[PDB]
Write a protein that binds this DNA or RNA. Structure first.
Length: 213
DNA sequence: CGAGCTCG
DNA sequence: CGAGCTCG
């Protein structure tokens, strides 16, 4: 599949910031610069595996628009694949994780707000997740102490991974272990159910929701 | 939006 | 110990 080919590829060590003079500067523990990196590392992979499947790859002309990458076969436009890069970290190892997966009031509700292409033209919503555990010369690369260790990857459907609680107007993912994400041990009984649930979020959870029917 | 801290 | 407040 295109999915398969991507997954396989995904299955990520930065050293630092390099200077034209060859000078290398170790980076740091800023939880923000890092999420930007997992996105630099990605662009190429997604790009390469797509092209080898006759798919043009689109990026938003403006920050703050979904999703990170739009995929499609020029031939067919009402069948797009939206890829979004998500990142998270752990303080210890093998803890339960949780992500933030978007706004529950944008396109999800109005079809056009904040999305690159009209939500209705998108057949799938993948989430590539990355989990991590919280001068120099080209030769010393092995000496630059990294800013985090033991990274993990997973390709997955947004609705599968989707939670019922809300971030802290953003959607929260389930609050599980890395294994549960890969497998797809979610909460919603479907995309339809995901949609509906999140479209009518002002019910206070998936159980209270089913009853609400 | 994400992160350090608090207080019950 | 952790949900949430409050500050970046």
């Amino acid at each position: 599949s295109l999915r398969s080919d991507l997954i396989n590829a995904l299955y990520y060590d930065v050293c630092g910031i390099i200077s034209a003079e060859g000078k290398i500067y170790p980076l740091g523990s800023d939880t923000k610069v890092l999420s930007t990196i997992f996105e630099l590392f990605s662009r190429p992979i997604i790009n390469k595996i797509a092209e080898k499947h006759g798919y043009i790859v689109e990026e938003p002309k403006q920050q703050n628009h979904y999703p990170d990458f739009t995929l499609y076969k020029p031939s067919e436009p009402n069948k797009k694949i939206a890829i979004d890069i998500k990142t998270t970290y752990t303080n210890k190892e093998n803890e339960k994780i949780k992500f933030t997966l978007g706004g529950y009031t944008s396109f999800i509700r109005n079809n056009t707000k904040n999305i690159v292409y009209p939500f209705d033209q998108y057949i799938a919503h993948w989430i590539i997740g990355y989990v991590y555990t919280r001068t120099y010369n080209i030769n010393e690369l092995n000496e630059i102490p990294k800013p985090y260790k033991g990274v993990k990857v997973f390709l997955q459907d947004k609705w599968v991974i989707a939670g019922d609680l809300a971030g802290s107007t953003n959607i929260g993912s389930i609050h599980a272990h890395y294994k549960d994400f890969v497998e797809g041990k979610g909460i919603f009984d479907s995309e339809d159910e995901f949609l509906d649930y999140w479209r009518n979020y002002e019910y206070n959870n998936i159980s209270e929701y089913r009853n609400w029917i």
